[PDB]
Each structure stands twice: as C-alpha cells, then as structure tokens.
Write a protein that binds this ligand. Structure first.
Ligand SMILES: CC(C)(COP(=O)(O)OP(=O)(O)OC[C@H]1O[C@@H](n2cnc3c(N)ncnc32)[C@H](O)[C@@H]1OP(=O)(O)O)[C@@H](O)C(=O)NCCC(=O)NCCS
Ligand SMILES: *C(=O)CCCCCCCCCCCCC
Ligand SMILES: [Cl-]
Lengths: 8, 392
C-alpha cells in the first residue's frame, strides 16, 4: 500500500 | 515494524527471511530473479486460523464493494500519530482494482465464518514493469489490510503467501509494491512533500502548524494562488487525446529506471478523467498538437477524533509529462486546478524530476518515506529521481 504523510 | 532504516537494521524478519528477496544488509550487484520460476504450484489455499475463510470479492456487487470500502475506511493505513487514515472511495477502488487484465481471484478477502464480516484483504493487478534493461510481466500488490481486532496474529504473512500462490497460478513470478515500513529490501526510497492549498484547515487539524516566525496572515498570503491557470491551451483530457497521451508518456518514461509499460487501453484507464478519482489536463498548442499533460488522483483521508473537521481532501501527483511547457509551469497549473476543485493539500513524491520544482513551488517536506520494492527480482537500488512509477 501507500503511506500517509504529514508536514515535517 | 520500522519506518526508519535505523530501527530496521535492529530487526529480525522471520517472515521476510523465508521470501525470495535480498537481505536488508547486503548490496546487490546482479540483475535477475532471486529464484527460478516454479513449474508446479500448490493447489490448495493456505490454512487460515480457525474460524476464518477465504473469499474472492466481486467488486461489481455494490454491497461487496461497500464492505471493502468499510474495511479500509476503518482499518487501513494511518499516519505515525494516528491522526489521519486513508479514505479510498468505492469508485476509486474500482478504478484501482479493475484495470485491464484484472482477475477476480486477485481480490483476496478474509471473512469471519459465522458473521461473514470482512476482516482482511490484499490485492494484485497485472502490469508490465520496466526495470533497468528488462521488461517483465509482474503484478502490483496493494491494499494489504488486516482488521484492527485481528492484528499481530500472523494473518498478514498468510495473505501475502496466498496472493503469491494465486499469482503463481497465472504464470507470474515477480511483483512490485510500496510501503511506509522498511522491509527487505527497498529498490528505492521516496519522500512525500505537501503543498498547502487551504492552510487554515491544515493548521486547525494539525496536519501542519505555523512557524513561530510566521503569522497566520502571512502563511495564508504565502500560499495564495491565482484563480486560473496560466498555460495556453490547457484543457481536460478527452477521448481523442488517448493515442498522444500514450505516446508522450511512453517516451517520457524512458529516462527512468523503474517504470510502467502501458498499453493504450491502460492509458485510457489510468488517465481518462473521472470526477473525484483521476484528473488529467493536456496542453493543446496553437497548431492543435498536444505537447504536455498533467495528472493527479483524488485520495481523501479521515480526520480521526475531531469534533468539527471530519475529512482532509488530498490530491496526489500522478504522471506529469513535459516536452514544450516547462515542468514548473505545468505543476503551477496543477496547484491552481487542485485549489479550484476544493482540495486542501497537494501531495507529490520526490521521484522522477519532482525535486526540480518542490521547493520553488512551496511544498513542505513530509514525515513519511515511501519505500519501493520488487519481489523475486535482484537489482541495484536507485535514487528517487530514477523512480518513474506511481501507485495508488
Ligand atoms: C499492515 C498490516 C496488514 C499487517 O498486519 P499485522 O497483524 O500488524 O502483522 P502480523 O502479525 O500479521 O505479521 C507481521 C509480519 O507482517 C510484516 N509486515 C508488516 N507490514 C507489512 C507491509 N506493509 N507489507 C509487507 N509486510 C508487512 C511484517 O514485516 C512482519 O513480518 P516479519 O516478521 O518478517 O517482520 C496491518 O497492520 C494493517 O492492516 N495496517 C493498516 C494498513 C496497512 O498499513 N497496510 C499495509 C500498506 S503497505
Ligand atoms: C501494500 O498494501 C503493499 C503490501 C505488500 C505486501 C508484500 C507482498 C509482496 C509479494 C506479492 C506476491 C508476489 C507474486 C509473485
Ligand atoms: Cl471484481
């Protein structure tokens, strides 16, 4: 699967 | 699991050590299969823990598709801090799971025998993959999910072994897939970057926060975009553009080391615009010729445990081909179009030539690495800018 990312 | 290579070095892979993939430690200097093609394949499904059964999901049944949506909506991938979860829509799942050549048995579900509750899933789709100087028929693995209540009970190795068997039955012995975790052994490591389109919403939900040195007023101004795109003759992709989009894509991808090889039917499927799924815009110039195109797909996320904001609307960069328009103006128009369509953030990886525009166009680096993997294929690793493959 994909991977969830957020800022930093 | 280990997201960093640091923690991965300190790990033992009871399951992955049994699989035909290079060890995390070694460096690869050869090109080819880890093990030869098997000429006899196990006929029986692998044994599941008592109380559970296999079930191939006919996604053409709206109710079965709904169960899959609900399983993923509640149990699929989350960020590091358990703040966001992918919310793939039913119609998106049809786009990603029924491309040309799809097989029903490759939508591999696990159900509770008594309740029939769908509690596990994994999928394969076929794809021709170009890796260095070899073109191989492979599968793409995606949507590996185990219900939160069934976790840590050895179910994921069974799903992996069972989809492998079903793929082997069709004569295919290599696979490509991505993950946020480090596994044996990445062919390349990409990093997500994020471009804020609705910065207020992104800060209230803590997808982002302010710089100490910037105010909310400045932060909004810094991310302000024009109301309409700048490139002449940019327009949504149409049926008449399928041959030329296929042509531009095929020639553009030759400069990278890991790429899809798409038939024209696959190009229609992956790029022909579908509302709230996939957007593609072409550049038809003053002579009537299509010279460039941009594309991004739609993948919202659930905002968990928040009383007011429930979902984050995300656009994901897909394939962007330039031959006359500069890439940086191409991606600038992508941001405007995504803003126009209601998106809160625009995501893109650091692969292909994306690094040439990420900082200039005001993306912020993310916290998640996306690892790329080949199964039963030994080849040297590659930098992100040589990776020319984007999954969903
Ligand atoms: C990922 C998921 C299916 C794994 O299930 P789990 O119950 O926690 O793990 P299990 O107890 O069944 O078995 C652990 C094995 O699975 C491996 N594994 C964990 N995540 C994996 C992944 N994305 N891909 C392949 N293998 C994975 C582990 O490396 C481990 O093998 P090892 O002993 O060689 O290290 C489950 O956590 C889940 O559904 N997470 C939410 C969605 C998700 O992350 N999907 C995968 C996207 S790449
Ligand atoms: C995202 O959901 C990826 C999860 C990947 C699990 C690894 C499985 C890879 C091997 C697949 C079978 C290969 C068939 C030749
Ligand atoms: Cl189906």
């Amino acid at each position: 699967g994909n991977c969830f990312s957020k800022r930093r | 699991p280990a997201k960093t290579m640091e923690e991965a070095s300190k790990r033992s892979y009871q399951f992955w050590d049994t699989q035909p993939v290079p060890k995390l430690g070694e460096v690869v200097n050869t090109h080819g299969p880890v093990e030869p093609d098997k000429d006899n394949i196990r006929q029986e499904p692998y044994t599941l823990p008592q109380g559970f059964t296999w079930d191939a999901l006919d996604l053409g049944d709206r109710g079965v598709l709904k169960e899959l949506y609900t399983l993923l909506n509640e149990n699929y991938v989350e960020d590091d801090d358990n703040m966001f979860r992918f919310d793939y829509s039913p119609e998106f799942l049809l786009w990603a799971l029924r491309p040309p050549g799809w097989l029903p048995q490759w939508h591999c579900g696990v159900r509770v025998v008594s309740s029939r509750k769908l509690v596990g899933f994994i999928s394969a789709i076929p794809a021709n993959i170009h890796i260095y100087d070899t073109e191989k028929k492979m599968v793409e693995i995606n949507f590996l999910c185990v219900h939160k209540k069934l976790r840590s009970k050895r179910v994921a190795p069974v799903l992996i072994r069972e989809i492998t068997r079903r793929v082997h039955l069709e004569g295919i012995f290599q696979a490509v897939y991505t993950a946020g975790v480090v596994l044996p052994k990445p062919v390349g490591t990409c990093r997500y970057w994020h471009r804020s389109l609705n910065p207020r919403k992104l800060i209230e939900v803590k997808f982002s926060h302010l710089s100490r040195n910037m105010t909310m007023q400045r932060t909004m101004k810094l991310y302000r975009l024009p109301e309409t795109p700048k490139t002449a003759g940019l327009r949504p992709m149409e049926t008449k553009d399928i041959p030329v989009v296929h042509q531009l894509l095929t020639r553009y991808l030759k400069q990278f080391h890991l790429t899809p090889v798409m038939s024209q039917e696959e190009v229609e499927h992956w790029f022909y615009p579908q509302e709230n799924i996939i957007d593609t815009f072409v550049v038809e110039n003053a002579n009537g010729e299509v010279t460039d195109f941009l594309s991004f797909y739609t993948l919202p996320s659930t905002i968990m445990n928040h009383p007011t904001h429930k979902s984050l609307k995300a656009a994901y960069s897909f394939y962007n081909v330039h031959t006359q328009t500069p890439l940086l103006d191409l991606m600038s128009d992508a941001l405007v179009l995504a803003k126009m369509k209601g998106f809160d953030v625009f995501n893109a990886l650091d692969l292909m030539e994306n690094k040439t525009f990420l900082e200039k166009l005001k993306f912020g680096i993310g916290d998640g690495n996306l690892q790329y993997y080949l199964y039963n294929w030994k080849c040297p690793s590659m930098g992100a800018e040589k990776v020319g493959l984007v999954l969903q």
